[PDB]
């Protein structure tokens, strides 16, 4: 319905969305609130049926399959600490749908 925030550790944040199938164009954006400022980490646009992704930033690693699409940031460090929002947009066909999850705070430390 909306994006699924995931976290990998023992250091990655992962948005997971299941496309309706009708939708042929999908954009997953990852933003971050830290120090009184919200910021785009990265975005990626997915052509369903062509199973092809277009990453708007090099920092992230987008991946596509038949139904489900995935956008990942890896190697998070102390300064990457902040609130992480998954955003999901159904571009084409209409209707346009937007799903913004409540953020999931990430705290990182490096001994």
């Amino acid at each position: 319905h909306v994006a699924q925030p995931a976290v990998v550790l023992a250091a990655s944040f992962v948005c997971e969305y299941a496309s309706p199938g009708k939708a042929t164009e999908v954009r997953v954006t990852v933003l971050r609130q830290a120090d009184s400022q919200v910021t785009e980490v990265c975005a990626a646009t997915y052509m369903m049926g062509n199973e092809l992704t277009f990453l708007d930033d090099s920092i992230c690693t987008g991946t596509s399959s038949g139904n489900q699409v995935n956008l990942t940031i890896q190697g998070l460090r102390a300064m990457d600490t902040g609130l992480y929002i998954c955003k999901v947009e159904l571009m084409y066909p209409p209707p346009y749908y937007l799903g913004i999850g409540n953020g999931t705070q990430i705290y990182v430390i490096d001994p």
């Epitope: 933003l31 009184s36 919200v38 910021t39 609130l83 929002i85 346009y96 953020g103």
Partner: nanobody, 128 residues
């Protein structure tokens, strides 16, 4: 998933005052940025004001800064626009808008876009 419904728009005399209510029907929070837009009779969609919900930070269009003010109270979960000293150039259809977007672009005065959640609109006629 968020819904928006504007209200308070209507007939007013030029030089008058009016405040528009936008009742958000979802979960807004810190990361969200909410704003007001207007569509002039002939001209397309213009951004009048925006807020970074999290911060106090606000943006205002050159035409309306010092006359228009934009307000929010988490308690009610509703965005407000106070329009003070109206004009023949203010008369338009005022649309409520909300989206989680970079702060620099939210307050940058270039927000615009067809993306984000939008209200049904409310008609504001002010003239004669």
């Amino acid at each position: 998933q968020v819904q928006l419904v504007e209200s308070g728009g209507g007939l007013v005399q030029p030089g008058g005052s009016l405040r528009l209510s936008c009742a958000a029907s979802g979960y807004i929070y810190s990361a969200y940025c909410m704003g007001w837009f207007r569509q002039a009779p002939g001209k397309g969609l213009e951004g009048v004001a925006a807020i970074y919900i999290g911060g106090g930070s606000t943006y205002y269009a050159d035409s309306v800064k010092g006359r228009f003010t934009i307000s929010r109270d988490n308690s009610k979960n509703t965005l407000y626009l106070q329009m003070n000293s109206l004009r023949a150039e203010d008369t338009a259809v005022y649309y409520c808008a909300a989206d989680v977007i970079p702060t620099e672009t939210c307050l940058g005065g270039s927000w615009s876009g067809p993306f984000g959640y939008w209200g049904q609109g409310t008609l504001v006629t002010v003239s004669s």
